[PDB]
Structures are given as C-alpha cells and as structure tokens.
Amino acid sequence: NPNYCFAGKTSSISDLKEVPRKNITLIRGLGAFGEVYEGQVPLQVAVKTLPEVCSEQDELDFLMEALIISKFNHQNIVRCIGVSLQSLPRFILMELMAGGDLKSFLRETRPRPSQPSSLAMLDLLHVARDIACGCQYLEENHFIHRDIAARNCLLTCPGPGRVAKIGDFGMARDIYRGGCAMLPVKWMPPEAFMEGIFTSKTDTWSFGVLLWEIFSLGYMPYPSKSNQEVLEFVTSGGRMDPPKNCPGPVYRIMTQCWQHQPEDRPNFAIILERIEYCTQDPDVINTALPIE
C-alpha cells in the first residue's frame, strides 16, 4: 500500500475511514473514468466508484485520490466521509454537493428572460472568494493543485446560500504518482506548459482563468482558440479580453494573476484582499450581468 504525505504528515490506506458496505445505499446516478452516485450512509453522500474492470495503476490512482482528499481539512474543500475499499466496486464517499459542478451551474443559472435575476455580481464574487479561500489553504500547506478550473469546483446547493468548494484533485494525483492532448493547457502558465515547472504561482495563474470562467458565466476560455493556438498566444503575451459586462476591478485581478513572471503574480492572501475590495465597491456589485 502506497504512502501519502501532506503537510509533513504521512498517511496510509489503513488511515482511511472504511465504512461497512452494508451501510451504504446507492440512490441515483449523478463520462470520465468511473461513475458517481447519490447515496446514503441517514447521511447523504456522493459516491465515486472504481470500475471493476481496471488496471493496477487505476487501482493505485483511486487509492491515492482517497488519501489526498481525506487529509484536507478546510471549509472550501469537499469533505471525504470515508471509503469502501474492501468490497467491489470500490467506493469513495464524499460530501454531497447538490449544486453540482461550477461550470454546469454557471451555464444553467445564467440570467434569462425567464430567470431575469438568477445571478448577480455578488453571487459570482462570493464563489470567487470561496475558491480563493480553498486555494489559500492549499498554498499555505504547500500543495499545488495544477488544475484550478470551473469543472473541478462544486456547489453545496443551487440556492443563494451556496458555498463553492474545490472537488477534484485528479491532476495532482497523477503528478504525485494521460497525454499532451489531455493537459489543461488553457489553465496553465507559460513556465508550466513549457518547462513543466510548477509552484504556488501555478495555481494563481489558473485562478485567473477560473475568474474569467466565473464572470463569463461558464464560457470556455479563449473563445474559438485551440490548445496550440492558446499556447502560442499566451507565450507571446496574449491575454483574454474581459468577459461581457465584467467590472474593471475584477478584470484587473485576472490580469494580475496572468503576469508572465510568477514572482509578479499575487499570492492568494492578496487575491482575497482584492476580491473583498471588489465586494465592497458599489459600482462593481451594482453592475448588471448580461441576460441571454
């Protein structure tokens, strides 16, 4: 059984909370490798499954995922309730995030003539703050996520009291121990996709892209550009334009996250400070989002 180290503390498969399989009931499904279900332990959970038809590396990958999420402890990182590894198919049990992933949420909850006031600027700033808080936790514990993106964040509920959390750590899992075409190039800084150099400032760049995703209400970054076109564009100093109706102060946080030199990019303490200032500024939060 592989070991995992986080914050200088080492854990093993023996440290995972094994929940008896008889206590777990699948309720309903919720494309990638494996399925996800809503389940009950009652305690409502999301259940990630490992296909019984998998390789040894798929097994090790699944195990490492369990170890990684079980060792985080922060309000903006999805909780792991436990695992069921002693029966097949193997399960990882997670906090049920009823709002689903952030990208889907943004696309489905866009303001529309039918839902004219579904979202406001403050909703978006709160999501940004939530994920930046999770990112700050990761930074201060020296963990590099490597794929901070809307598709990897989840919401606790659809409604106004929603909290956003980081939910998928597959890329970090892969690196901890795929192909070029699967690399999240549109979320990666130049030194990452060029030299394979990752630091805390890697996630700062990606967070800038997430911010663009949030304020675009769920558009794919770099509209109309392929991965290689983005690589060349960003390497040459190109950056995305502001999302439709994006307040200047918010776009300015994006452009600071996308500084070419990692040393010139803000850490997450500074990002949080700037997001908070935006939330205080009436001219920002009184700005109307586009209606489709």
| Catalytic one of 61, 130, 147, 203 | 147
The residues that bridge with 26 in the sheet, in sequence order, are: 39
Size of the site for ligand VGH (CB under 6 A): 16
The residue from 26, 30, 41, 183 that contacts ligand VGH (CB under 6 A) is 30
Q: Interface with ligand VGH includes 94 (CB under 6 A)?
A: yes
Q: Which residue's structure tokens are 């696309």?
A: 107
Does 221 sit behind a cis peptide bond, omega within 30 degrees of 0 on the bond before it? no
What is the C-alpha to C-alpha distance for residues 24 and 14, in angstroms, rounded to an integer? Answer: 20
What is the C-alpha to C-alpha distance for residues 274 and 128, in angstroms, rounded to an integer? Answer: 11
Element holding 231 (H helix, E strand): helix 227-235
Q: Token pair for residue 143?
A: 């963990």
Given a contact cutoff of 8 angstroms between Cβ atoms, the answer to whether 19 and 93 are in contact is yes
Residues across the chain: 292
The residue from 16, 19, 24, 46 that contacts ligand VGH (CB under 6 A) is 46
User: Interface with ligand VGH by CB under 6 A: which range of 96-104, 125-133, 205-213, 221-229?
Assistant: 96-104
Of 73, 59, 83, 85, nearest to 2 (Cα)? 59
Orientation of helix 121-140 relative to helix 200-215, angle to 10°:
170
The residue from 51, 100, 249, 262 that contacts ligand VGH (CB under 6 A) is 100
283 classed as catalytic? no
HSE-CB for 59 with a 13 A CA cutoff: 12
Q: Interface with ligand VGH includes 101 (CB under 6 A)?
A: yes
C-beta closer to ligand VGH: residue 102 or 278: 102
Quick note: the x/- pattern for ligand VGH over 216-255, rule CB under 6 A, is ----------------------------------------
C-beta closer to ligand VGH: residue 19 or 78: 78
Please tell me whether 244 is known to bind a ligand: no
- Residues forming the active site: 147
Binding site for ligand VGH (CB under 6 A): 30, 36, 46, 48, 78, 94-98, 100-101, 152, 154, 167-168
Binding site feature residues for ATP = 48
Binding site feature residues = 48
